[PDB]
């Protein structure tokens, strides 16, 4: 009941409920030893939507993300987007010439260059299963 | 040892044009470099389409893994 | 002059060095393909002329000197990277 | 012996010789016996009462003179005295602002991972009371989301001592980071954008970032060049090491029987 209703308030843009259920269920947070969420998850209260928008949209104007994050200011919304790309939350870029915030490029060389860098571990893990099988085989 | 002959034929063609660029023996104008003039144009390594040879490398890898 | 380093020659270099007009560089290279001293191809949206060349002739001792340096780079690439393969796969060689 | 507990503390300390007397006071206390076991014995805790107090006023005189390796030196030994295993040790009334000096210093030099793991030893003083500690953790919360300006509008409110020798460094390491964002491909603006983004309708700060940074004022137009690299690629570079990996595949198939 605390944690399911916690992420209930996180997904919506409501902070008054977020502060209410902190006050309601803080003593349960005392038993779990997790006081520190209130100081470090209020960061992601504003950063969850900008992760959600930049995954949905592809080439957005900063004048429209202000009302969509209900921040009512385009001038600091540059800085929230600047902090998220600084933290590597979204890989996107900003056009600071006429107000464009565009996302990344298309699906990349993922079909060509990547998959052997997953395949090397799976060779090495499965033959070690074959090695650990054969070495521990014959006790009689 | 297939590649140990690749430098062995290379060290022989190394020694020949050292002693004819030096200029000891007369330059065979007919075949000794005119056939090499044909040779020295075709190690084509043009990248950005031959880079896309390597999902077939992933394909040859995929059956192994 | 450029030995297949970037042999995709642009049209203005031919039109200047042959001092021919721009519209006649295509009829000039189709003649050289018709004779058979070159086996390239022609792009026209970029107007760059791709080159594959099989006609040999004399090469005037100074170009052996540059051919030596390219053969010496060719030497240490073959030699050292064979020592990499042999030292790596020594125990399954026999 | 028992050297000037409030000698030149209250009015002024322009001293350099009492700094040597404090230097000798360090040679007195830390050569008495030790402070390592600390089993019981309030009588041998009595010099531990004074050893805290002389390092508190040593940390007071350190920030009075702005010595950076010394200030972490006195504070670590003070934190080692709150690392006492048998802490009877009545509450010195300077502790909360002393840790607030440490909380603000370690915030300023970009020890942000060390910042939050420092906050574990504070049970409930962050919420109930203690504006000496509540102010830098409200400051770090302002650095969290997007709120640069609430930091600089709470600049004119320190309930503690002046804190100026830390917050001059703390804001300078903010200004160059936003300068580090604007020294990217963001090409040209005017002084009024340096007034809005950076701050400060004209002081000599526009001279400060003309000489430190670039930002030459042209025909009422600044200039910042492109910091974007060329990205040299071949993407057949791993041809050696991929040829290495397949060798130990068959080497681990054969040869180990």
Curated annotation (Swiss-Prot), chain A:
Domain (PCI) ranges: 1-108
Disulfide bonds: none
Origin: domain of life: Eukaryota
Residues found modified as Phosphoserine: 61, 73
Function according to Swiss-Prot or TrEMBL: Component of the 26S proteasome, a multiprotein complex involved in the ATP-dependent degradation of ubiquitinated proteins. This complex plays a key role in the maintenance of protein homeostasis by removing misfolded or damaged proteins, which could impair cellular functions, and by removing proteins whose functions are no longer required. Therefore, the proteasome participates in numerous cellular processes, including cell cycle progression, apoptosis, or DNA damage repair.
Stated family: Belongs to the proteasome subunit S3 family.
Subunit and interaction comment: Component of the 19S proteasome regulatory particle complex. The 26S proteasome consists of a 20S core particle (CP) and two 19S regulatory subunits (RP). The regulatory particle is made of a lid composed of 9 subunits including PSMD3, a base containing 6 ATPases and few additional components. Interacts with UBQLN1 (via ubiquitin-like domain). Interacts with ERCC6.
Protein name: 26S proteasome non-ATPase regulatory subunit 3
Name of the coding gene: PSMD3
Curated annotation (Swiss-Prot), chain B:
GO cellular component, one term: extracellular exosome
Keyword tags: Acetylation, Isopeptide bond, Proteasome, Ubl conjugation
Protein name, per record: 26S proteasome non-ATPase regulatory subunit 7
Subunit structure: Component of the 19S proteasome regulatory particle complex. The 26S proteasome consists of a 20S core particle (CP) and two 19S regulatory subunits (RP). The regulatory particle is made of a lid composed of 9 subunits including PSMD7, a base containing 6 ATPases and few additional components. Within the complex, PSMD7 interacts with subunit PSMD4 through their respective MPN domain. Interacts with TRIM5.
Similarity comment text for this entry: Belongs to the peptidase M67A family.
Remarks, miscellaneous: Does not bind a metal ion.
Organismal lineage: Eukaryota, Metazoa, Chordata, Craniata, Vertebrata
Role of this protein: Component of the 26S proteasome, a multiprotein complex involved in the ATP-dependent degradation of ubiquitinated proteins. This complex plays a key role in the maintenance of protein homeostasis by removing misfolded or damaged proteins, which could impair cellular functions, and by removing proteins whose functions are no longer required. Therefore, the proteasome participates in numerous cellular processes, including cell cycle progression, apoptosis, or DNA damage repair.
Location of this fragment in the whole protein: 196 to 260 of 324
PTM annotation (N6-acetyllysine): residues: 9, 19
A GO MF term: protein homodimerization activity
GO biological process, any: proteasome-mediated ubiquitin-dependent protein catabolic process
UniProtKB/Swiss-Prot annotation, chain C:
Cleaved signal peptide residues: none
Superkingdom, taxonomy of origin: Eukaryota
Chain positions found as N6-acetyllysine: 16
Transmembrane segments: none
Subunit structure: Component of the 19S proteasome regulatory particle complex. The 26S proteasome consists of a 20S core particle (CP) and two 19S regulatory subunits (RP). The regulatory particle is made of a lid composed of 9 subunits including PSMD13, a base containing 6 ATPases and few additional components.
Family: Belongs to the proteasome subunit S11 family.
Function text: Component of the 26S proteasome, a multiprotein complex involved in the ATP-dependent degradation of ubiquitinated proteins. This complex plays a key role in the maintenance of protein homeostasis by removing misfolded or damaged proteins, which could impair cellular functions, and by removing proteins whose functions are no longer required. Therefore, the proteasome participates in numerous cellular processes, including cell cycle progression, apoptosis, or DNA damage repair.
Identification of the protein by name: 26S proteasome non-ATPase regulatory subunit 13
The organism of origin for this protein: Homo sapiens
Residues of the full protein shown: 283 to 376 of 376
From Swiss-Prot, chain D:
Organism: Homo sapiens (Human)
The protein's assembly and partners: Component of the 19S proteasome regulatory particle complex. The 26S proteasome consists of a 20S core particle (CP) and two 19S regulatory subunits (RP). The regulatory particle is made of a lid composed of 9 subunits including PSMD8, a base containing 6 ATPases and few additional components. Interacts with DDI2. Interacts with TASOR.
Protein name: 26S proteasome non-ATPase regulatory subunit 8
Entry function: Component of the 26S proteasome, a multiprotein complex involved in the ATP-dependent degradation of ubiquitinated proteins. This complex plays a key role in the maintenance of protein homeostasis by removing misfolded or damaged proteins, which could impair cellular functions, and by removing proteins whose functions are no longer required. Therefore, the proteasome participates in numerous cellular processes, including cell cycle progression, apoptosis, or DNA damage repair.
Residue range from the parent sequence: 94 to 350 of 350
GO cellular component term, pick one: nucleus
Record lineage: Eukaryota, Metazoa, Chordata, Craniata, Vertebrata
Keyword vocabulary terms for this entry: Isopeptide bond, Phosphoprotein, Proteasome, Ubl conjugation
Domain PCI: 69-238
Residues found modified as Phosphoserine: 13
Keyword Transferase: no
Crosslinked residue numbers (Glycyl lysine isopeptide (Lys-Gly) (interchain with G-Cter in SUMO2)): 204
GO BP annotations listed: proteasome-mediated ubiquitin-dependent protein catabolic process
């Amino acid at each position: 009941m605390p944690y399911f209703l916690l992420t209930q308030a996180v997904r919506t843009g409501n902070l008054a409920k977020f502060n209410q259920v902190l006050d309601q269920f803080g003593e349960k947070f005392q038993a779990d030893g997790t006081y520190t969420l209130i100081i470090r998850l209020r960061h992601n209260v504003i950063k969850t939507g900008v992760r959600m928008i930049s995954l949905s949209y592809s080439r957005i104007s900063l004048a429209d993300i202000a009302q969509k994050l209900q921040l009512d200011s385009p001038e600091d919304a540059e800085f929230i987007v600047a902090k998220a790309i600084r933290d590597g939350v979204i890989e996107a870029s900003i056009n600071h010439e006429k107000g464009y915030v565009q996302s990344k490029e298309m699906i990349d060389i993922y079909s060509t260059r990547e998959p052997q860098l997953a395949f090397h571990q799976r060779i090495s893990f499965c033959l070690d299963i074959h090695n650990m099988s054969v070495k521990a085989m014959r006790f009689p | 040892h297939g590649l140990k002959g690749l430098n062995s034929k290379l060290l022989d063609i190394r020694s020949y044009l050292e002693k004819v660029a030096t200029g000891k023996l007369p330059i065979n104008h007919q075949i000794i470099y005119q056939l090499q003039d044909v040779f020295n144009l075709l190690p084509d390594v043009s990248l950005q389409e031959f880079v896309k040879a390597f999902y077939l490398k992933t394909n040859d890898q995929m059956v192994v893994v | 002059t450029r030995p297949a380093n970037h042999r995709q020659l642009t049209f203005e270099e031919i039109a200047k060095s042959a001092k021919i007009t721009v519209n006649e560089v295509e009829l000039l290279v189709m003649k050289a393909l018709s004779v058979g001293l070159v086996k390239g191809s022609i792009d026209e949206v970029d107007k760059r002329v791709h080159m594959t060349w099989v006609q040999p002739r004399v090469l005037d001792l100074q170009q052996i000197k540059g051919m030596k340096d390219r053969l010496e780079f060719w030497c240490t690439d073959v030699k050292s990277m064979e020592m990499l393969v042999e030292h790596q796969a020594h125990d399954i060689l026999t | 012996m028992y050297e000037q507990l409030k000698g030149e503390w209250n009015r002024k300390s322009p001293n350099l010789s009492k700094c040597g007397e404090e230097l000798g006071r360090l040679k007195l206390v830390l050569l008495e016996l030790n402070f390592l076991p600390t089993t019981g014995t309030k009588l041998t805790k009595q010099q531990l009462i004074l050893a805290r107090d002389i390092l508190e006023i040593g940390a007071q005189w350190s920030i009075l003179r702005k010595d950076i390796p010394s200030f972490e030196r006195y504070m670590a030994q003070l934190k080692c005295y709150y690392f006492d295993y048998k802490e009877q040790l009545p509450e010195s009334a300077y502790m909360h602002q002393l840790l607030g000096l440490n909380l603000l210093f370690l915030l300023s030099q970009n020890r942000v991972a060390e910042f939050h793991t420092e906050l574990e030893r504070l049970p409930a003083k962050d919420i109930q009371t203690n504006v000496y500690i509540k102010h830098p953790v409200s400051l770090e919360q302002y650095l969290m989301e997007g709120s640069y300006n609430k930091v600089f509008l709470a600049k004119g409110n320190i309930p503690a001592e002046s804190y100026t020798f830390f917050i001059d460094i703390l804001l300078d390491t903010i200004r160059d980071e936003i300068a580090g964002c604007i020294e990217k491909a963001y090409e040209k603006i005017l002084f009024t954008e340096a007034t809005r983004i950076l701050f400060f309708n004209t002081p000599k700060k526009m001279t400060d970032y003309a000489k430190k940074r670039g930002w030459v004022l042209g025909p009422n137009n600044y200039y910042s060049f492109a910091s974007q690299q060329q990205k040299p690629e071949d993407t057949t570079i791993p041809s050696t090491e991929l040829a290495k990996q397949v060798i130990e595949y068959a080497r681990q198939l054969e040869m180990i029987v």
